[PDB]
Amino acid sequence: GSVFWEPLSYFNPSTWEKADGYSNGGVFNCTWRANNVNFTNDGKLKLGLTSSAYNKFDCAEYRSTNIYGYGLYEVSMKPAKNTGIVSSFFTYTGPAHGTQWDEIDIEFLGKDTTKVQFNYYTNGVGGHEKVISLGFDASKGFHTYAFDWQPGYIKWYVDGVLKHTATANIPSTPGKIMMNLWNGTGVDDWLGSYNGANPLYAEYDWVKYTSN
Ligand SMILES: [Ca+2]
């Protein structure tokens, strides 16, 4: 169908918004700052994790102003490497647009950038985690990650290769496209403990959403 092709060359307020001045609270141990949303000279979204106060942490999230439905989502990215942090790409609808909570994820646990974590939420329920081995260290360069979201399945790919398939209670509300980098608290078993290492950066080259 129709193709949304976002090359992330500069901030376009019509299509994107920078989260700012707040914290998601919970496992999220940092405050979203618009100042942490940058663009490189060669057109990369540069998400930055800083400490602008002794044990205070500044993090970053970029998200779509519009909403999207079924189809192919691809991203070319380069995650941060560190204990206690997540770099991600996901779809998201919750009460955000006064609905139930539906979500599709691609998460890189900074403690082990040699792996990826797939997962999804359907009406607030998750626990669909799937960890796969990359065969490479994600943090060294840009690679291509995607999910094909249709009404009866989700399919995850890496550099073009089917890695995972999900068939049950597949989400169905449309949602926004989101990218964020953050340090977790009291999920250590999951993310490892964050040692305050900073600044940390996650990089995005482009996003493409292909409808139908
Ligand atoms: Ca680009």
UniProtKB/Swiss-Prot annotation:
Instruction: Please name the GO terms that the record assigns under molecular function.
Output: licheninase activity
GO terms (BP aspect): carbohydrate metabolic process
Task: Name all GH16 domain ranges.
Answer: 3-212
Family annotation (Gene3D superfamilies): 2.60.120.200
Q: What is the effect of changing E103 to D/N/A/L/P/R/H/C/S/Y?
A: Loss of activity
Q: Which PROSITE patterns match?
A: GH16_1, GH16_2
Q: Where is the active site?
A: E103 (nucleophile), E107 (proton donor)
**Known catalysed reaction(s)?**
Hydrolysis of (1->4)-beta-D-glucosidic linkages in beta-D-glucans containing (1->3)- and (1->4)-bonds
**Other noteworthy facts:** Beta-glucanases of Bacillus have a substrate range similar to lichenase of germinating barley.
Q: Which family does it belong to?
A: Belongs to the glycosyl hydrolase 16 family.
* UniProt protein name: Beta-glucanase
Give the species: Paenibacillus macerans
